[PDB]
């Protein structure tokens, strides 16, 4: 089998500048006879499937843009981005076609550097809904943040909470390059009841002190209600 | 050309996973190669084979003798079978249109080789508040609590609300079951006056349900 081999990883890049990218096979992709290469470039944005972008290693698909430009022969191939856009954001993937089975690179994943963005944080108590159910779900989120490093501490009465809880990120955004992350803390309800003071702590580079949101337990009341305390 | 993909995304060890992809617009007859693909967790992407325009076929050896790929030409549909499966074969699986390189995709389905049951979801309210509320901006949303398997989709006010959505990843919990946030950022004034509801979506359970999400007051 022809074993293809894209040699970063990943790269970030910033808006407006140019990278390029190399996929090397383990024999030649050229046909004399033909002295074309039988190589191609798909695109995977987050949560899509491959796009064709480049066959014959250098000839555009209909559609796609001239900053997308393929190059190489032989064994030797490149995909060269310029002028990046936010949208650019996807995962590069080269595929031969010379011989059987059809085989595929391991993609090139292309990230767009931006400037910082502080993270919005948000914090949500459990439901009574929840909470009927033995269970505390107790959410901390931090929106639309740049770079993806953050770091979350739950506290509860001052405690530092290890081990129960869990962390997701979105992909990076197409159209403004951020992330965002949730982190969800969980506990018994028998547990959630012994305690008062529920705080979520975020420390990011565009935070020059840590931000701190926290409730204390039952201070939160049904929408509607408000009118007899107001 | 359009390529649409059908088939359960639950199989059991052993058990034989079965796909169909329906083409519309191209008859499979005419021309072309029509070829599942495979996307691992971790990336790597694999070509499966194909079924061509007359009928034969062409398989990755390291399938051996587990893969059939067949077709119906009275539907316009070629159909993936592949048997003895293993956890190994946990991927997102595409139908295609090929000429060598592949132009059209399917939308892709999520196949996973488990014993586990399938379990539909909780949907709980993350209620907007002050605890919530930064400027004029509230932040409300949806936790998608134990599922299985992967995939569940969230949609607010049935796609009418789209702007400033964010649909975690699932995550899996000791539990061995999914759960995910959907959560989504709306102008702090529109909370008294504007209808909040998360559409989910479990099909491996058929399980579809409707949470509105309303404020709470925290102080």
């Known amino acids: 089998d022809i074993k293809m081999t894209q040699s970063p990883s990943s790269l970030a890049v910033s808006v407006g500048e140019k990278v390029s990218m190399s996929c090397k096979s383990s024999?030649?992709?050229?046909?004399?006879?033909?002295?074309?290469?039988?190589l191609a470039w798909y695109q995977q944005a987050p949560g899509q499937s491959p796009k064709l972008l480049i066959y014959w290693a250098s000839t555009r698909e209909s559609g796609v843009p001239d900053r997308f430009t393929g190059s190489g022969s032989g064994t030797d191939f490149t995909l060269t981005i310029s002028n990046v856009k936010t949208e650019d954001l996807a995962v590069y993937y080269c595929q031969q076609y010379h011989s059987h089975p059809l085989t595929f690179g391991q993609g090139t994943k292309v990230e767009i550097k931006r400037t910082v963005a502080a993270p919005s944080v948000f914090i949500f108590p459990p439901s009574d809904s929840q909470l009927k159910s033995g269970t505390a779900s107790v959410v901390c989120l931090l929106n639309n943040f740049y770079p993806r490093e953050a770091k979350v501490q739950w506290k509860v009465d001052n405690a530092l909470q290890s081990g129960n809880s869990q962390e997701s990120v979105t992909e990076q955004d197409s159209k403004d390059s951020t992330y965002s992350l949730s982190s969800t803390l969980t506990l018994s309800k028998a547990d959630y009841e012994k305690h008062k003071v529920y705080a979520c702590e975020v420390t990011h580079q565009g935070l020059s002190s840590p931000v701190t949101k926290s409730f204390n337990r039952g201070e939160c009341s049904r929408g509607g209600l408000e009118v007899l305390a107001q | 050309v359009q390529l649409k993909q059908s088939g359960p995304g639950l199989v059991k060890p052993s058990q034989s996973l079965s796909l169909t992809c329906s083409v519309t617009?191209?008859?499979?007859?005419?021309?072309?190669?029509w070829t599942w693909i495979r996307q691992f967790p971790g990336n790597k992407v694999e070509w499966m084979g194909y079924?061509?325009?007359?009928?034969?076929?062409d398989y990755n050896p390291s399938l051996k003798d587990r893969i059939s790929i067949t077709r119906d030409t009275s539907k316009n549909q070629f159909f993936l079978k592949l048997n003895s499966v293993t956890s190994e074969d946990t991927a997102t699986y595409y139908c295609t249109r090929g000429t060598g390189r592949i132009e059209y995709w399917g939308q892709g389905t999520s196949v996973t080789v488990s014993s586990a049951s399938t379990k539909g979801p909780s949907v709980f309210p993350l209620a907007p508040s002050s605890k919530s509320t930064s400027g004029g901006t509230a932040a409300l949303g949806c936790l998608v609590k134990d599922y299985f398997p992967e995939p569940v989709t969230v949609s607010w006010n049935s796609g009418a609300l789209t702007s400033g959505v964010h649909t975690f990843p699932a995550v899996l919990q000791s539990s061995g079951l999914y759960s995910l946030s959907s959560v989504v950022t709306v102008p702090s004034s529109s909370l008294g006056t504007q209808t909040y509801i998360c559409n989910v979506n479990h099909k491996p359970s058929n399980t579809k349900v409707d949470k509105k999400v309303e404020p709470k007051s925290c102080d």
């Open positions: 024999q030649s992709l050229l046909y004399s006879y033909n002295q074309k290469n039988y």
């Open positions: 079924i061509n325009y007359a009928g034969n076929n």
């Open positions: 617009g191209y008859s499979i007859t005419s021309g072309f190669y």
